[PDB]
Write a protein that binds this ligand. Structure first.
Ligand SMILES: *[C@@H]1O[C@H](CO)[C@@H](O[C@@H]2O[C@H](CO)[C@@H](O)[C@H](O)[C@H]2NC(C)=O)[C@H](O)[C@H]1NC(C)=O
Lengths: 49, 1245
């Protein structure tokens, strides 16, 4: 289906909804480990490529 | 085997279609009746339709039943019905066959008014809406708009009254993503039909003239690799040659028709003159490649040529460019394939063959020689080779034709067709080998038709006449043959054809009725009873029916003119043979010129309508069954044949200045004449309309109308101008007078623009038939849209033209993004039903610019839901195994409590009517009794023991604390006693490295407790269980020191779970931490280990679970190994539910619902309680994620903005531009589920 595979989250971040595959146009909200806060736009979004 | 039947039906039943099903019986004499019926599958309980059909000699024992699967009578729901039973019943037979059904009923032709749009435009769009019958569908329909990133942007839905669905004009969002947008159209509710259309969003400007680049070939071969030749021409959009342009040629290498940017050339970079509309160019590809590149030979050049061309009009300000994105260098220039060729032999009858020679760019080569080698076998491998025939292709179609008068004994033909252009070697002459096979009758019994493979299509309403010849050992039995005529998937005609006394059979003398006008198909058959064995014999053929509409709506400009003046009052007469609706549109031909590589909106409409043909190829087949399958039919017969062997494979054989206006819908009561004034745009307008009637759709002939004037001005204002910059603006005046004369244009502009000209002029004379360049140098002070007229005051008077300048801010356009997930239940924890976004202002705003802002809410769907539930055994778990010693009372009641809470999830009182409702009061009573019992076992010191005089058990006390944590959901236990029990348990047994080591209780009651891996550090188990019990108690007895002991125990449990030990320990520890810090890094690392230990079935996991200790051994009954298995899996389930990882949990729930190891666990209390806890928590989290949220977004100081009714249906409100300069507060009602919303802020620096 050539969607998006799971991205590696940034340091001290994690995926709210870890999956094998994310749909085109689907956005994944990262979140920060117990000691950390998110700064910036915490969503990656699956592009058609 | 004399008494036989055929019922023949479409290969697939379309939902709601009227399907015509036809029955023939053979060798009966007494007039008898049958019923044909459609019934639910597999149960045959529900008749979707039935038809009584009388069969008699009077009918030649033939009839059809018309049967329809009404869409509402299907059960629908989560699972579409895939299959259905067709049934026949008579005095003499009954049989039923499983038909597939499909919901793909009808067509959704999306028409947008234009192929491309700029930002700050709106796309007027409408859909034509038809059944599988060509009647107007009258079905309510939803458009789904999709951006170039694939995000859904809007759903808009309309009720069809007409077959024309005029949707609301979709304003392009206040910041579009560029590129190809998509629209998908679906009927609501009950059909799968999906229309699709596209449009590109770009900052385009209307081209002033077309540039056409015209290579002689889309390939270069041996002949042209030395040198290639390529014409260029250009015309103004009023269809007159561009008199003079400077042409600059920019060749490049290419490798891929799809996309590449291979090295652009820097040699033979020809600059040349276009004259009288044409430039002729040539390219010595050999010289250019050898000079520029390290490539030097066509052998190195299985590749492509790029060319771009740009042309500058030699006396004016309009300049235009175009490209050919690849001319294929290849030693084999052509490719070859068969067309309309059966690959099935009619022996003795002439076998025609047609073969098409095609470009490497998928285009017809035209005239080429071809030779066809042929080899035949008749019988017993008796092999003979035929003389190789030779032919040449048709100069337009590229189709060569052949025919072989094969032997009457021929059984197979294998034949090799090779291109015979002598200038190509055989390795480059496109050549192919093919095999064609006889009908392979069992009883040497065949059916052939005289159809002369007519290359011309049949003409509507003519009497077609096809002669048909059965041949068989038993011809004197056959007496007649049947025929079926197929249009789309549907049997539109049927009949029978008697043997004359001549032993000659009636031909198919039939009118090609108007329902056949899409290319149609014919199948003929008979059953012959043989000596005693019946055989079904059949054949089929393809019939092209020349595409004549039913309406044939003819529409013409009654004041016929070569060209109209701008603003000319015109009378457009539409005439139709009958009352018809019509849709009308006008679009500037220059807009089709805007798209580099244009296409029309309704090209190929008829071949799209023909997609409903279920058959393929020219006809014939390997067998009667294969003939029926390839015709797109299926059949029920006792005559020793069946379709079922053949797969449903996807057979693929080949057989004022507006940009648009007049966008209107009208009734034409057979005729209506509509008069209107054309726009002021001096261009050819492409006028198109579509008639819609009960007869079907008909796209009218496209009307091209030229708007022309002897003199005019046009100005090359770009799509937008940078604010605060002096610009050079270029135009040219065009003279089509016979003679030159003095012209001036006085420009006049709003004070928002200044120019050095400061307009009366020299009033230059343009010479006749010529254009003169005009240029102004202007600076726009102000953003947005600004008016500027031009008056071409020339001969004895004024002239008027008007334009709007578009002004864009300097520097960079910049943007930011921010957003949140709204969470009114705290599914992720922090309840987040409100947020605010300030009116943030960047550090370097371009001082006069304003920040554009666009909000974008997005729904989050539940996904898959699993109906994991308890059986009516919940009633046994209420009445459960006798209360008494061994605390069989505790074993009975604690399940009563957990069942209580499961039922308390609510479904099992509203819906449980399938089973006996658990009486609320009875459940309450039993609950109360268990509460009293559990109290009775409490130790005086608020410890617990099973034996009255037994030791305190920290384990069993934690189990009590868990259960009494559940009970409060309906009947609180007196919290004082709970608090005292907690204080006892922690104060007595909180060790400082591990905790709550168990006291000297005589034994765990093995069915009440469980066996942990006591061989190593059972303190891990005890700590986990005590933690879990404390967790379930704390909310009813929050205590700071209990919190501290929790922290300690969690820390020890983490640090001592870093070695994996045994996976039961890992799962129960992970669950304990899931109750604690859901998000600690090492917690997650433990989770990532557990998820590694999970076994799965299927590559996408259908089931997921964990095993240890060789539990892979079979066990017919629950046991301690299955107890450990179920426990560790249930703890992993509970952990994953704490993670809310439904996509991970679902296959675990499905596994657990199997009850593999039937009865489960040891059937211990522990496994059962953890399993039910997991099932309840799953059904809870499922109903939590159910999305319902009325998210109301508003400004802080200013009013409300929008109120998205976010629902499983309306799950995605459109993006809203945040106009007003204020802080934004987004809010929701308590609602349900999760959603996320984003604002983007767009600004200049
Ligand atoms: C461009 O031409 C139009 C058409 O004449 C001008 O608009 C007219 O302005 C006068 C007043 O100056 C009104 O009385 C007319 O009714 C307007 N015509 C309309 C509304 O169609 C416009 O002002 C001109 N702009 C210039 C010269 O910059």
């Amino acid at each position: 289906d050539s969607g998006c595979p799971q991205p590696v989250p940034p340091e001290n971040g994690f995926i709210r909804n870890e999956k094998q595959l994310y749909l085109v146009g689907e956005d994944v909200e990262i979140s920060c480990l117990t000691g950390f806060e998110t700064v910036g736009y915490q969503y990656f979004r699956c592009l058609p490529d | 085997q004399e008494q036989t039947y055929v019922i023949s039906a479409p290969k697939i039943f379309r939902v709601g279609a009227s399907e015509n099903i036809v029955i023939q019986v053979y060798g009966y004499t007494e007039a008898f009746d049958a019923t044909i019926s459609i019934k639910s599958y597999p149960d045959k309980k529900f008749s979707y339709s039935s038809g009584h059909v009388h069969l008699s000699s009077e009918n030649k024992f033939q009839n059809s039943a018309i049967l329809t699967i009404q869409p509402k009578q299907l059960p629908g729901g989560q699972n579409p019905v895939s299959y259905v039973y067709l049934e026949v019943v008579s005095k003499h037979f009954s049989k039923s066959k499983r038909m597939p059904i499909t919901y793909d009923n009808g067509f959704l032709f999306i028409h947008t008014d234009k192929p491309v749009y700029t930002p700050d435009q709106s796309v007027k769009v409408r859909v034509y809406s038809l059944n599988d019958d060509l009647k107007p569908a009258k079905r309510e329909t939803v458009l789904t708009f999709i951006d170039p990133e694939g995000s859904e942007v809007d759903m808009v839905e309309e009720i069809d009254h007409i077959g024309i669905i005029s949707f609301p004009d979709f304003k392009i969002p206040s910041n579009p993503r560029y590129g190809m947008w998509t629209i998908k159209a679906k009927y609501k509710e009950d059909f799968s039909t999906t229309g699709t259309a596209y449009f590109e969003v770009k900052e385009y400007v209307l081209p002033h003239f077309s540039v056409s680049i015209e290579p002689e070939y889309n390939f270069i071969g041996y002949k042209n690799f030395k040198n290639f030749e390529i014409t260029i021409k250009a015309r103004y959009f009023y269809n007159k040659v561009v008199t003079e342009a400077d042409v600059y040629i920019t060749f490049g290498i290419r490798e891929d028709l799809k996309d590449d940017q291979k090295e652009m050339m820097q040699t033979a970079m020809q600059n040349t003159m276009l004259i009288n509309g044409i430039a002729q160019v040539t390219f010595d590809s050999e010289t250019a490649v050898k000079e520029l590149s390290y490539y030097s030979l066509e052998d190195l050049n299985n590749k492509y040529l790029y060319i771009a061309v740009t042309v500058i009009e030699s006396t004016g300000g309009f300049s235009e460019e175009a490209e050919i994105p690849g001319i294929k260098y290849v030693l084999s220039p052509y490719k070859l394939n068969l067309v309309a060729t059966p690959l099935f032999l009619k022996p003795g009858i002439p076998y025609p063959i047609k073969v098409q020679v095609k470009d490497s760019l998928d285009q017809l080569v035209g005239g080429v020689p071809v030779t066809l080698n042929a080899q035949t076998i008749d019988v017993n491998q008796e092999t003979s080779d035929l003389d190789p025939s030779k032919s040449v292709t048709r100069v337009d179609d590229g189709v060569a034709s052949f025919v072989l008068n094969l032997p009457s004994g021929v059984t197979v033909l294998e034949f090799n067709v090779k291109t015979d252009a002598p200038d190509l070697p055989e390795e480059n002459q496109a050549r192919e080998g093919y095999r064609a096979i006889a009908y392979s009758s069992l009883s040497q019994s065949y059916l052939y038709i005289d159809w002369t493979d007519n290359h011309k299509a049949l003409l509507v309403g003519e009497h077609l006449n096809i002669i048909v010849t059965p041949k068989s050992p038993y011809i004197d039995k056959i007496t007649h043959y049947n025929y079926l005529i197929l249009s789309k998937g549907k049997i539109i005609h049927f009949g029978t054809r008697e043997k004359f006394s001549d032993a000659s059979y009636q031909s198919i003398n039939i009118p090609v009725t108007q329902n056949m006008v899409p290319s149609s198909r014919l199948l003929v058959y008979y059953i012959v009873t043989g000596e005693q064995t019946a055989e079904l014999v059949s054949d089929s053929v393809w019939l092209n029916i020349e595409e004549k509409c039913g309406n044939q709506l003819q529409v013409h400009l009654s004041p016929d003119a070569d060209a109209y003046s701008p603003g000319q009052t015109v009378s457009l007469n539409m005439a139709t043979g009958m009352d018809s609706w019509v849709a009308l549109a006008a679009v500037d031909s220059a807009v089709y010129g805007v798209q580099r590589g244009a296409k029309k909106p309704l090209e190929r409409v008829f071949q799209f309508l023909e997609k409903s043909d279920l058959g393929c190829g020219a006809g014939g087949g390997l067998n009667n069954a294969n003939v029926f399958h390839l015709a797109g039919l299926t059949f029920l017969t006792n005559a020793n044949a069946d379709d079922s062997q053949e797969n449903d494979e996807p057979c693929k054989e080949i057989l004022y200045f507006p940009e648009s206006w007049l966008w209107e819908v009208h009734l034409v009561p057979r005729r209506k004449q509509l008069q209107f004034a054309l726009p002021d745009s001096l261009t050819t307008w492409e006028i198109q309309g579509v008639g819609i009637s009960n007869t079907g759709i008909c796209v009218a002939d496209t009307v091209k109308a030229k708007v022309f004037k002897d003199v005019f001005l046009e100005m090359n204002i770009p799509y937008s101008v940078v604010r605060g910059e002096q610009i050079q603006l270029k135009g040219t005046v065009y003279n089509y007078r016979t003679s030159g004369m003095q012209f001036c244009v006085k420009m006049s502009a709003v004070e928002g623009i200044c120019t050095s000209e400061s307009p009366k002029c020299v009033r230059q004379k343009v010479e006749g038939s010529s254009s003169h360049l005009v240029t102004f140098t202007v600076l726009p002070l102000e953003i947005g849209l600004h008016n500027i007229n031009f008056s071409l005051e020339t001969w004895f008077g004024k002239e008027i033209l008007v334009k709007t300048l578009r002004v864009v801010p300097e520097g960079v356009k910049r943007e930011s993004y921010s957003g949140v997930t709204l969470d009114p239940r705290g599914i992720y924890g922090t309840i987040s039903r409100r947020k605010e976004f300030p009116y943030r202002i960047p550090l370097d705003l371009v001082p006069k610019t304003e920040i554009k802002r666009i909000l974008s809410v997005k729904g989050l769907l539940v996904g898959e839901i699993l109906s994991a539930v308890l059986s009516q055994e919940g009633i046994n778990i209420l009445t459960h195994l006798p209360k008494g010693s061994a605390e069989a009372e505790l074993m009975s009641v604690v399940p009563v409590f957990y069942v209580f809470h499961y039922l308390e999830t609510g479904n099992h009182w509203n819906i449980f009517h399938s089973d006996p409702l658990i009486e609320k009061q009875k459940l309450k009573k039993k609950l109360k009794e268990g509460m009293l019992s559990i109290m009775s076992y409490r130790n005086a010191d608020y410890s617990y023991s099973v034996w009255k005089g037994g030791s305190a058990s920290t384990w069993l006390t934690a189990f009590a604390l868990r259960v009494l944590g559940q009970v409060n959901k309906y009947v609180e236990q007196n919290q004082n006693s709970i608090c005292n029990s907690l204080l006892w348990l922690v104060e007595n047994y909180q060790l400082d490295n591990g905790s709550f080591k168990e006291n000297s209780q005589y034994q765990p009651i093995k069915l009440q407790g469980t066996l942990p891996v006591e061989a190593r550090e059972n303190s891990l188990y005890l700590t986990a269980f005590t933690v879990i019990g404390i967790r379930k108690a704390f909310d009813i007895c929050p205590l700071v020191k209990i919190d501290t002991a929790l922290i300690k125990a969690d820390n020890f449990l983490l640090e001592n779970t870093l070695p994996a030990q045994s996976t039961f320990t890992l799962a129960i520890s992970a669950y304990a931490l899931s109750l604690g810090d859901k998000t600690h890094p090492q917690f997650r690392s433990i989770v990532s280990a557990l998820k590694r230990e999970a076994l799965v079935k299927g590559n996408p996991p259908i089931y997921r679970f964990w095993k240890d200790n060789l539990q892979h051994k079979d066990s017919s009954v629950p046991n301690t190994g299955t107890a450990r298995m179920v426990e560790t899996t249930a703890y992993a389930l509970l952990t994953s539910l704490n993670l809310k990882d439904i996509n991970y949990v679902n296959p675990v729930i499905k596994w657990l619902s199997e009850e593999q190891r039937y009865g489960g666990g040891f059937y211990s209390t522990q496994d059962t309680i953890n399993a039910i806890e997991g099932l309840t928590e799953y059904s809870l989290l499922v109903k939590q994620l159910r999305l319902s949220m009325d998210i109301d977004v508003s400004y802080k100081h200013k009013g409300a903005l929008h109120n998205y009714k976010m629902t499983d249906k309306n799950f995605l409100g459109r993006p809203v531009e945040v106009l007003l300069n204020d802080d934004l507060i987004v809010s929701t009602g308590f609602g349900s589920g999760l959603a996320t919303v984003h604002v983007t802020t767009v600004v200049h620096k």
